[PDB]
From a paper:
[name] [name] ([name]) plays a critical role in [name] transcription initiation and [name] DNA (mtDNA) packaging. Both functions require DNA binding, but in one case [name] must recognize a specific promoter sequence, while packaging requires coating of mtDNA by association with non sequence-specific regions. [name] is composed of two tandem high-mobility group (HMG) domains connected by an α-helix linker. In this study, we identified two [name] residues, Ser61 in HMG box1 and Pro178 in HMG box2, that form specific hydrogen bonds with N2 of two guanine bases separated by 10 nucleotides (GN10G consensus).
Here, we have determined additional crystal structures of [name] in complex with [name] ([name]_B) and a non-specific (NS2) DNA substrate. We were able to obtain data to 2.7 Å. Despite the shift, as in other crystal structures of [name]-DNA substrates, in the [name]-[name]_B structure, two HMG boxes interact tightly with the DNA duplex via the minor groove and generate two kink sites the intercalations of Leu58 (HMG box1) and Leu182 (HMG box2), inducing a U-turn in the DNA substrate. Despite subtle differences in the sequence, the structure of [name]-[name]_B revealed the same guanine-specific interactions as the other two [name]-[name] structures, further highlighting the importance of these interactions and indicating that the [name] binding site is not modulated by crystal packing. Replacement of both guanines in the expected guanine consensus to adenines (G-20/-31A(L), L stands for [name]) resulted in a ∼50% decrease in transcription activity. Thus, our results confirm that the G-20/-31(L) is important for proper transcriptional activity of [name].
Residue numbers in the entry:
A (entry chain A): 44 to 233
B (entry chain B): 44 to 232
The structure:
Amino acid sequence: SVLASCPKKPVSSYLRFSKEQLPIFKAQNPDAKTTELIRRIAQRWRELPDSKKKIYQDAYRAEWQVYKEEISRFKEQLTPSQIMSLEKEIMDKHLKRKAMTKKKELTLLGKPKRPRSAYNVYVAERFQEAKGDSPQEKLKTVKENWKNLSDSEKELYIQHAKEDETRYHNEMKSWEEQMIEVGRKDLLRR
Amino acid sequence: SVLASCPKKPVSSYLRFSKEQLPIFKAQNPDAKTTELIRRIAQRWRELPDSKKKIYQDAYRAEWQVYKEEISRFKEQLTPSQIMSLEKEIMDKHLKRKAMTKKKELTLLGKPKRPRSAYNVYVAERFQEAKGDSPQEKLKTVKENWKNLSDSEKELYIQHAKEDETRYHNEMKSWEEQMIEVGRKDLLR
DNA sequence: TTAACAGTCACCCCCCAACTAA
DNA sequence: TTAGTTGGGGGGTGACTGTTAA
DNA sequence: TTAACAGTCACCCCCCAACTAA
DNA sequence: TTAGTTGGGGGGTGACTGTTAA
Ligand SMILES: [Mg+2]
Ligand SMILES: [Mg+2]
């Protein structure tokens, strides 16, 4: 909101060149992957004479002066609630990024999945079957049938969830052992 | 601060017992460490019959109903800016705790200080002599003097800065080997 | 370090809810 | 308490390939 | 997982600014 | 950029001893 309307920083010399060169590179090489294009765009930039590189840098320097003005004026007109709101959206964005990043790291390290409850096994073995014109609607049907489920049938799912608790404790022991060895005792359950 | 005036959740049964016992234990054992008293308080709690622990738990349950009311009333009168401020205050406190925890740990583990620059070694030797009756004011007089320092005499501090940098590397090497024994690649790069 | 550009991909997050380890 | 787990549609995003500089 | 109580200790934080590795 | 480093005054706080439960 306040962060969305906040002036952004100008784009440095190379990225200006890249932004403009990517479409003309993509047009001439349609089935070439973007990584391949950027590799060559970067080459062209490094092979570009400094008389021309400078032109892109001068544009950036002049834009930096517009930005310095725009951000100063923007921050002067912000009320205390808007300043704290801006600070809160920045930190909230930063924490979601940092969370997502650590969830990706833990997945690459091969961290075991947490235990699947008796309800989770019911969702797994009874989702796609149940009526519903949407996944949200299908979960409500599964939840309604989970409540209506007899105590004899609940014991079928309680058992599967008991076997998954055993598999979590065994998998966590090996993973945690492995993590001590890889020098990552910080990841262990305290 | 919205958070400061925010009703706090009731203390659970053990902590109620602790709050009341600590003064009695402290009076009867004046030269005992608080840690030693809490250890004994925790044992008296463990040893307390469940008929008596249930009394402390009933107080808590009844107190939880007062809290549910007080927090509901409090949140209804909060403004969108105050709601957003409270949420920010809670998260800010949480992050400061997590930062401090990592700073204390590194200090516990004996992590060395980073390398200090020519400007740092300059304010380390001449801060005393600097004019001012406040640390903030008298540090300001060394900045305008750091600028007015000729580059020839400024070179005298950059040699002594690198003298310290070599010491930092030797301490860092010893600490990092002692940390791979703890088993923490998380603390290295 | 990391945000600043972009096309494609493959992975994560939100929501619906319930359950439960940390 | 939070967060992650079952399901997936329909959004959102870091890594990849690069350089610059705040 | 962490907030909820407390006494003591040995730090840490935040301000003023400049400088600089990551 | 951020964060940490030089200085310290003037407050703030996690570890330590513990259990409960949101
Ligand atoms: Mg997303
Ligand atoms: Mg990139």
